[PDB]
Amino acid sequence: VFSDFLLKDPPESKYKGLRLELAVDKLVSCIAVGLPLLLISLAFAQEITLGSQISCFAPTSFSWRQAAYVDSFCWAAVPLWLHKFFPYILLLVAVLLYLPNLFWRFTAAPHLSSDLKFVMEELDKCYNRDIKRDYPIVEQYLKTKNNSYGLIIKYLICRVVTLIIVFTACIYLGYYISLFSLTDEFTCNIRTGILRNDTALPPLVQCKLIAVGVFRLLSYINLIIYVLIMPFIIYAMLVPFRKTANVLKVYEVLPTFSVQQAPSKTYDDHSLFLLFLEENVSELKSYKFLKVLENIK
Amino acid sequence: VFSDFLLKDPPESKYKGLRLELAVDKLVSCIAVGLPLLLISLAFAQEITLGSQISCFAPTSFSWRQAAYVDSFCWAAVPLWLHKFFPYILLLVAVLLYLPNLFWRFTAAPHLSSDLKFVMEELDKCYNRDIKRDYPIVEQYLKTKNNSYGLIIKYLICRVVTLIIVFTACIYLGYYISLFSLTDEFTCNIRTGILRNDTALPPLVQCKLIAVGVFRLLSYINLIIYVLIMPFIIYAMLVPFRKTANVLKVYEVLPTFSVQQAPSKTYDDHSLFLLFLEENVSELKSYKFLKVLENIK
Numbered sequence: 404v405f406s407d408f409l410l411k412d413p414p415e416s417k418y419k420g421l422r423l424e425l426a427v428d429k430l431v432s433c434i435a436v437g438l439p440l441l442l443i444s445l446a447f448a449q450e451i452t453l454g455s456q457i458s459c460f461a462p463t464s465f466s467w468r469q470a471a472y473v474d475s476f477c478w479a480a481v482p483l484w485l486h487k488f489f490p491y492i493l494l495l496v497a498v499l500l501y502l503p504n505l506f507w508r509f510t511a512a513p514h515l516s517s518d519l520k521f522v523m524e525e526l527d528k529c530y531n532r533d534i535k536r537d538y539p540i541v542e543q544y545l546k547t548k549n550n551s552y553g554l555i556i557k558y559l560i561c562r563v564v565t566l567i568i569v570f571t572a573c574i575y576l577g578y579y580i581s582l583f584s585l586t587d588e589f590t591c592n593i594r595t596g597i598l599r600n601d602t603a604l605p606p607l608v609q610c611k612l613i614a615v616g617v618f619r620l621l622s623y624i625n626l627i628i629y630v631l632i633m634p635f636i637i638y639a640m641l642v643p644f645r646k647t648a649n650v651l652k653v654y655e656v657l658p659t660f661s662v663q664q665a666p667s668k669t670y671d672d673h674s675l676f677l678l679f680l681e682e683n684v685s686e687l688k689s690y691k692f693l694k695v696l697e698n699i700k
Numbered sequence: 701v702f703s704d705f706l707l708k709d710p711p712e713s714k715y716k717g718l719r720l721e722l723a724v725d726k727l728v729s730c731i732a733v734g735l736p737l738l739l740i741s742l743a744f745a746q747e748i749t750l751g752s753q754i755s756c757f758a759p760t761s762f763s764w765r766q767a768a769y770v771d772s773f774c775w776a777a778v779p780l781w782l783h784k785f786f787p788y789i790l791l792l793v794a795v796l797l798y799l800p801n802l803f804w805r806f807t808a809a810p811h812l813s814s815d816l817k818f819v820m821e822e823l824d825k826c827y828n829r830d831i832k833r834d835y836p837i838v839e840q841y842l843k844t845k846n847n848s849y850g851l852i853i854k855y856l857i858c859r860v861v862t863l864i865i866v867f868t869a870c871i872y873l874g875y876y877i878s879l880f881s882l883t884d885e886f887t888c889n890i891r892t893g894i895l896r897n898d899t900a901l902p903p904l905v906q907c908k909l910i911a912v913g914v915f916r917l918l919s920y921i922n923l924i925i926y927v928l929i930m931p932f933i934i935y936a937m938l939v940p941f942r943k944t945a946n947v948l949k950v951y952e953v954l955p956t957f958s959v960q961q962a963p964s965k966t967y968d969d970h971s972l973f974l975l976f977l978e979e980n981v982s983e984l985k986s987y988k989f990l991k992v993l994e995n996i997k
Binding site: 412447465466468469479487502506514543546597 | 711712717719723726727730731738742745749752755756757758760762764767768771824827828831832884885887904905906908910912913914917921982983985986988989991992993995996
């Protein structure tokens with residue numbers, strides 16, 4: 404009985420290439436973080452070529468600096484801040500979106516990695532020794548992960564943070580779009596604190612926001628992409644209803660492994676671990692041999 | 701008896717991946733250092749596009765440079781320095797926050813690393829040889845760390861430095877917010893030292909601070925994030941009341957290891973070492989075998 408409990412070695416950097424994120428979470432994260440960076444890079448580029456935020460039509464009686472004053476004054480205060488702070492909300496949401504994958508990498512990745520390596524090495528050993536009564540090591544190990552919750556708790560944490568951030572960004576951009584595309588100019592007053600009773604200046608002045616066009620374009624692009632990537636976040640968040648293949652069911656054609664009685668797919672570590680195992684089954688060497696073998700029969 | 705005291709080798713770069721910081725301290729440090737850098741990067745970017753700090757409405761009778769003089773003069777002196785020095789306090793607190801993890805890395809990390817490697821190699825040897833009377837090497841070694849204090853002293857040093865810096869930054873930003881969001885302009889005088897009795901200049905002039913909006917936004921963001929990450933610092937600082945799993949209790953199902961009588965969780969090196977051991981138990985190979993083994997029984 405107890406002979407295949409002795410730990411010998413990993414006889415290589417054998418795995419070195421396990422994937423610890425299910426490729427859809429990976430694509431979604433890359434896109435959602437990258438898009439605002441490209442947008443605001445272009446934004447800052449064009450704004451540093453324009454070299455101004457607004458332009459006011461000052462009266463000729465002013466000098467240079469006397470007009471620069473009103474042009475700087477009217478850049479301060481219907482909300483104008485949804486325009487003043489646009490290139491900052493995007494960086495903010497980009498960084499907030501980068502955070503959850505850091506959370507994953509530092510709190511769940513190494514545990515999951517060790518578990519995957521253990522299960523895979525055990526399966527390879529079992530097949531290799533029984534192709535030529537022991538205890539169901541892998542069966543009992545996977546039975547242990549049937550009332551724990553840490554892995555799935557952390558997973559759902561990451562997914563819900565991502566969904567919340569994307570939803571908020573969407574409604575912000577939407578209000579921007581539905582508010583600014585009706586005009587781009589406004590009336591500004593200057594004589595307020597000391598010049599209040601100074602008749603040497605106009606009672607009003609006009610100024611125009613000179614980036615509304617580009618910002619509206621970027622808003623449309625970002626909103627479309629985000630509403631496109633929301634459903635994938637939800638489909639990922641629905642773990643116990645995804646599509647699997649039961650690699651543990653392909654392994655049951657050898658003399659003494661198991662016969663998996665019946666699953667239930669509840670929210671627990673068993674389901675998430677099975678998902679990661681199926682994603683990484685590309686590296687299990689014995690898998691293809693057993694597949695063709697059960698095909699011959 | 702004395703046979704398992706001979707040092708043979710680490711038969712690989714076996715561990716090469718121990719984690720020397722408990723993932724919550726890691727996340728907190730990354731966030732707290734990174735956030736002000738992103739904020740002040742954006743600040744310096746926008747301020748170099750604006751190319752000015754204030755704007756004063758000089759009388760038309762001035763020339764160009766004669767108005768530049770008042771515009772530069774009134775940028776000097778209710779505190780205006782809380783506005784003048786804003787992009788510097790943030791870099792200061794970022795660097796002060798980076799310091800404690802350097803302190804940890806240089807005074808505690810290598811000792812802890814050697815200790816972890818020793819304990820883990822010893823446990824693996826013990827299991828591997830007794831799965832097929834000796835002295836409790838690991839039990840006595842962990843007994844030695846029961847009246848020393850260096851590790852926990854350094855740990856608490858780092859945590860309290862972090863908490864102090866975060867608290868001070870919070871109250872600074874709070875005073876900024878509660879002071880500047882009532883106005884953005886002030887009255888300035890010029891004729892003071894030589895032009896005092898020079899009637900060729902106005903008795904007053906107005907100037908406006910042209911970054912109050914952006915700085916207030918950054919202040920809100922930073923204050924919210926810092927008050928969010930304070931509780932985690934405290935929860936970390938409360939070492940002897942955290943949640944563990946007693947991996948040394950899972951190891952006691954083999955013939956001659958121990959039976960852990962009773963803990964007390966006082967402030968000492970034993971508790972902190974147990975925390976680090978539980979964090980790094982992902983690499984102990986025998987751990988999962990023993991877990992499934994005690995499950996079968």
